[PDB]
Amino acid sequence: SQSNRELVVDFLSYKLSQKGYSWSQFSDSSLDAREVIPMAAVKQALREAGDEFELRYRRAFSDLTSQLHITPGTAYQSFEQVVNELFRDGVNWGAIVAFFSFGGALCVESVDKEMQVLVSRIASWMATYLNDHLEPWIQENGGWDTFVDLYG
Numbered sequence: 001s002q003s004n005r006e007l008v009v010d011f012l013s014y015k016l017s018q019k020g021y022s023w024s025q026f027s028d029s030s031l032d033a034r035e036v037i038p039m040a041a042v043k044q045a046l047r048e049a050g051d052e053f054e055l056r057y058r059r060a061f062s063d064l065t066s067q068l069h070i071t072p073g074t075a076y077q078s079f080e081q082v083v084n085e086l087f088r089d090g091v092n093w094g095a096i097v098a099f100f101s102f103g104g105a106l107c108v109e110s111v112d113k114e115m116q117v118l119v120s121r122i123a124s125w126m127a128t129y130l131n132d133h134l135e136p137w138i139q140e141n142g143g144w145d146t147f148v149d150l151y152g
Contacts, residue, residue, distance in 0.1 A: 001135060003037060005127040008103070010043045011050060012123055015104035021111040023119060041152065042144045049097045049151040050104060061102050070106055072117055079125045084133075091137045093147050099129070 013023050022028055068074065068082045086098050103126045110118035138144065 001131050004130040008123050008126045011046050011100050012107050014047055019108050037144050041148050045148050045152045050101050053097050053101045076125050
């Protein structure tokens, strides 16, 4: 799905930017029958929610990130295995915000450590994770319109 990919990139570029980094080494009415997301509102809400999450949990992921110990060698399987652990008690919208914040944080840390190559990898992994693992839940749970109504 192109729009979970779009939410991944928006969220990660906002996190990178907020810490003073960048994506790339030179990147500096409807009608009554219908049905879509709609994006700019999901992206804003995910942003604010990711920021609240980071403000509340100074701690999280240090266990998780040391478990991935991500390098230019890491494959998708290993990321998928660590993220499965954020979802160990099941999925809900809080666990989804923690998943995005985790990806934000591996990104920032990778830039920090000189492994900018990992940014697009993580983004690509997240989009795959979301589409394989989380999408069937999201669609059943009110879709993204519902996440907005809780974290908008």
